[PDB]
Design a protein around this ligand. Structure first.
Ligand SMILES: OC[C@H]1O[C@@H](O[C@@H]2[C@@H](O)[C@H](O[C@@H]3[C@@H](O)[C@H](O[C@@H]4[C@@H](O)[C@H](O[C@@H]5[C@@H](O)[C@H](O[C@@H]6[C@@H](O)[C@H](O[C@@H]7[C@@H](O)[C@H](O[C@@H]8[C@@H](O)[C@H](O[C@@H]9[C@@H](O)[C@H](O[C@@H]%10[C@@H](O)[C@H](O)O[C@H](CO)[C@H]%10O)O[C@H](CO)[C@H]9O)O[C@H](CO)[C@H]8O)O[C@H](CO)[C@H]7O)O[C@H](CO)[C@H]6O)O[C@H](CO)[C@H]5O)O[C@H](CO)[C@H]4O)O[C@H](CO)[C@H]3O)O[C@H](CO)[C@H]2O)[C@H](O)[C@@H](O)[C@@H]1O
Ligand SMILES: OC[C@H]1O[C@@H](O[C@@H]2[C@@H](O)[C@H](O[C@@H]3[C@@H](O)[C@@H](O)O[C@H](CO)[C@H]3O)O[C@H](CO)[C@H]2O)[C@H](O)[C@@H](O)[C@@H]1O
Ligand SMILES: OC[C@H]1O[C@@H](O[C@@H]2[C@@H](O)[C@H](O)O[C@H](CO)[C@H]2O)[C@H](O)[C@@H](O)[C@@H]1O
Length: 752
């Protein structure tokens, strides 16, 4: 057998003979491959391999690339582990005016190297263990081993030796300003403050020289917030508690909308009586939302400066964050003051649209487009057109979700394949290194889930597990599996601690991992919420709610900097386009103009997009900066996306710009995205802007006791929107005291 049946569909278990469709282009052909054969992991790491992580380069490269376990940067090498900290003098903000790009970055330097007394010629560094956000890297050379435990949000690096002892090697002799024998407080020549800890009685030697040595088979390194002896004493308390387990456990309180996440470590004692706990370094998206019960654990003056702003210290076994899920919708309802016949015209115009490629991404954009059009067609009373759209979605999905052709043999394209080596579903044709690097599975498969959710909204039978739902559930498991999934690692895309998704499967860059389109991540989470609600899968829905809500908190900090605290004052733009572990760029992965470096973090527009309007002052600030740089409202590309975004705070302005230019060009044209972005339509644009004009501003201050809703506020007048996926009527309670009844399979208002 070369395929596994899942309901009416199947996935391939053997790499297919790819149908290249006569395309000779080497770039295209190279995309139709598999992720690396070699995984640098020990035999202690078994089953589906974790990917899309901040630490991924350890698994892919023989050693590693540069990594960002904030507050540190580290890299594995034959000689040992290089440790670095970007001080203010290491940080730069550069603009390339001609490219239209900006870059906030540090250096790839070495403050010191953690070394093993027995060898400076390790053969490889492997993943020996990992948990929700820490990794254990193992440098190996026969009997000589050095195990390094580190993580994002850990001011400790824990070092365990086999057949040797500790060495810290420096290019310029450090200033050892506190010598407690087994504990040392030290500074680099350029005044970066660190500490090293060994068991009592194991004293440091070589003070005043370039090489600090210790006979111990265990040391910890800490980054100190300050050259402060009291802080050193505090770090000493947790320096011998090596993190083994780390979990981010969450709950969703449906009644209140509260997503509660508890981050909990389990440590192993390296000396008698070492506490079960650590010192955490919290990111802004965490500490801005710290639970009251965690406040007492904060170490107030323990601050670290990093790319993502200020980290703060917190001591103990666990801490808790509290966030608010704002709801999502399957679409905007029919509440706009549009010319209905004009909208009908645009809906029929959209039948000329076609996918601009055969790969999962371009096909994804097309099916997202059709899924967006179908509820608008329904609302306008174009019921057969809506059915045509959903029929076309059915045809496409029923093709892609089957791995075998009529003869029973594997297809050459439009299929999914399970790579057993890593443990991931890959789609062919592939693009953006979705197969070769395990990239972007949330971005691509999110569109497939969108299509499935729209089908399920009208046809529950299709969506059943024994029919086509099984295969959709498989795609979702690939990118956001629960724990103990036999086929996939836990929550592939998501970093529970950094608070965001990472797009690159391999992370083999010296800036760590990256994410560009945070909105396509949010699109994926939205669609899983919708799909799971439609198919009555509460556990899956809640997981997607947790992801949507957490990612939102990271987006507002690191992509948007809504609070105006993170980006350097000298940084011109009002958005970071690509977030990396170690840097921030106003730039795109492809060659683009001015609009795209903003709008790649807005697209696509859908019923889960309302998170983009929670901060009206930000929306204004970002729009005004883009307008300033353009010099007018003559957008270089994707005009409709700018209008839709503008409509969050000024729909009159959005409407005026739309009226002037929407009809500039006629039917679908792949070569011309000046007015209409290729994943968008005139129909969507017109429907969105007019809806916003009537509804007013997004109102995030009101929650509901059901998950599929939105609240708008126009000069004090609230509009409450709920979609009911149930066969039964429901009552929804809003947090401001308002209450509504909703009929089965309908909006409460604006069904059309
Ligand atoms: O249905 C399917 C459909 O599919 C189609 O198939 C397609 C197919 O067409 C295509 O074919 C290819 C052709 O398209 C191609 O034609 C090109 C054309 O693309 C190009 O366009 C130019 C634009 O690309 C360009 O855009 C700019 C962006 O590129 C730029 O992106 C930047 C990133 O670069 C940057 O990345 C950095 C990263 O580099 C860095 O990496 C580190 C390494 O450098 C380092 O190396 C070390 C070294 O440092 C040391 O000194 O030495 C050692 C030596 O051993 C070395 O190892 O290693 C470290 C790790 O240790 C690395 O880290 O890492 C950092 C992070 O750490 C990373 O940042 O990242 C930034 C973001 O941060 C990103 O912005 O960005 C700018 C700004 O936005 C952008 O402008 O722009 C110019 C114009 O200005 C364009 O010209 O043009 C050329 C020339 O005209 C064309 O040739 O040709 C190739 C063949 O060569 C084809 O493959 O292929 C795709 C798949 O790829 C396929 O899907 C079919 O066609 C279709 O029919 C079908 O229907
Ligand atoms: O307008 C023609 C122009 O379009 C370009 O397509 C871009 C995509 O390259 C871009 O890909 C994004 C990725 O960089 C990453 O964020 O992940 C997903 C894909 O996995 C995408 O968000 O997406 C935008 C928006 O859909 C597209 O406009 C072509 O690359 C370029 O060659 C072409 O000239
Ligand atoms: O890293 C995730 C992103 O990767 C992008 O592709 C990269 C190529 O453009 C570049 O030439 O090479 C690197 C590997 O060295 C690729 O990762 C994708 O286009 C993005 O969609 C993706 O998010």
């Amino acid at each position: 057998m070369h395929a596994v049946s899942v309901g009416k569909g199947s996935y391939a278990t053997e790499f297919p003979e790819i149908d290249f469709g006569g395309i000779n282009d080497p770039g295209f052909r190279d995309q139709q491959g598999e992720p690396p054969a070699t995984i640098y992991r020990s035999d202690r790491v078994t089953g589906p391999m974790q990917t899309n992580s901040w630490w991924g380069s350890l698994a892919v490269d023989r050693f590693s690339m540069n990594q960002y376990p904030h507050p540190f940067s580290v890299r594995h090498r034959a000689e040992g582990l290089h440790v670095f900290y970007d001080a203010p003098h290491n940080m730069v903000v550069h603009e390339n005016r001609e490219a239209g790009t900006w870059h906030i970055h540090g250096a790839i330097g070495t403050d010191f190297t953690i070394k093993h007394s027995g060898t400076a010629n390790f053969e490889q560094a492997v993943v020996d263990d990992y948990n929700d956000w820490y990794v254990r890297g193992l440098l190996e050379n026969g009997a000589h081993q050095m195990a390094i435990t580190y993580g994002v949000g850990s001011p400790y690096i824990f070092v365990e030796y086999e057949d040797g002892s500790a060495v810290l090697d420096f290019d310029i002799a450090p200033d050892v300003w506190e010598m407690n024998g087994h504990v040392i407080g030290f500074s680099t020549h350029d005044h970066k403050h660190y500490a090293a800890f060994a068991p009592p009685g194991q004293n440091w030697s070589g003070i005043g020289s370039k090489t600090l040595t210790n006979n111990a088979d265990y040391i910890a390194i800490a980054k100190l917030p300050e050259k402060d002896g009291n802080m050193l004493a505090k770090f000493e308390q947790y320096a011998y508690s090596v993190v083994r387990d780390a979990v981010a456990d969450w709950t969703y309180d449906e009644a209140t909308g509260t997503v509660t996440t508890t981050f909990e470590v389990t440590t192993e004692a390296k000396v008698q009586g070492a506490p079960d706990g650590t010192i955490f370094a919290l990111y802004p998206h965490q500490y801005r939302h710290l639970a009251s019960s965690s406040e007492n654990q904060l170490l107030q003056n323990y601050q670290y400066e990093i790319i993502r702003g200020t980290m703060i210290g917190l001591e103990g076994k666990r801490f808790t964050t509290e966030l608010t899920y704002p709801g999502v919708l399957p679409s905007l309802p029919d509440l706009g003051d549009y010319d209905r016949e004009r909208l009908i015209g645009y809906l029929h115009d959209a039948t000329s649209d076609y996918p601009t490629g055969s790969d999962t991404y371009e096909l994804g954009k097309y099916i997202g487009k059709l899924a967006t059009l179908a509820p608008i067609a329904d609302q306008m009373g174009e019921y057969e057109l809506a059915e045509q759209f959903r029929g076309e979605l059915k045809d496409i999905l029923e093709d892609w979700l089957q791995a075998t052709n009529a003869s029973g043999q594997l297809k050459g394209k439009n299929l999914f394949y399970y790579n057993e080596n890593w443990g991931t579903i890959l789609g062919y044709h592939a693009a953006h290194s979705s197969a070769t690097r395990i990239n972007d599975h949330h971005f691509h498969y999110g569109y497939f889930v969108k299509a499935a959710a729209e089908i399920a909204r009208a046809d529950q039978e299709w969506a059943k597990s024994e029919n086509w739902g099984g295969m959709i559930d498989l795609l979702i498991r690939d990118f956001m599996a629960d724990r103990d999934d036999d086929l996939f690692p836990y929550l592939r895309m998501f970093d529970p601690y950094s608070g965001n998704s990472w797009a690159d499967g391999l992370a083999t860059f010296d800036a760590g991992n990256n994410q560009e389109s945070s909105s396509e991540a949010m699109h994926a989470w939205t669609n899983v919420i919708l799909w799971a609600e439609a198919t009555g899968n509460k556990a899956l829905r809640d997981r997607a709610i947790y992801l949507y809500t957490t990612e939102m908190s990271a987006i507002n900090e690191y992509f948007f900097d809504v609070h105006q605290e993170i980006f350097p004052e000298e940084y011109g733009p009002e958005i970071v386009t690509i977030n990396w572990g170690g840097k921030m760029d106003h730039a795109t992965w492809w060659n683009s103009g001015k609009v795209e470096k903003y709008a790649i973090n807005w697209l696509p527009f859908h019923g889960g997009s309302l998170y983009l309007g929670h901060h009206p002052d930000y929306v204004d600030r970002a729009y005004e900066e883009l307008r300033r740089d353009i010099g007018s409202t003559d957008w270089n590309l994707w005009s409709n996306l700018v209008w839709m975004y503008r409509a969050f705070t000024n729909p009159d302005d959005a409407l005026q710009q739309m009226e002037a230019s929407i009809d500039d060009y006629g039917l679908f044209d792949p070569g011309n995205e000046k007015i209409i972005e290729r994943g968008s339509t005139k129909a969507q644009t017109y429907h969105w802007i007019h809806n916003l004009a009537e509804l007013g501003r997004v109102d995030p201050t009101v929650t509901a006791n059901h998950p599929i809703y939105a609240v708008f506020n126009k000069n004090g007048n609230r509009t409450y929107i709920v979609y009911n996926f149930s066969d039964s009527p429901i009552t929804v309670q809003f947090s401001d005291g308002h209450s509504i009844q909703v009929e089965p399979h309908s909006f409460n208002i604006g069904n059309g």
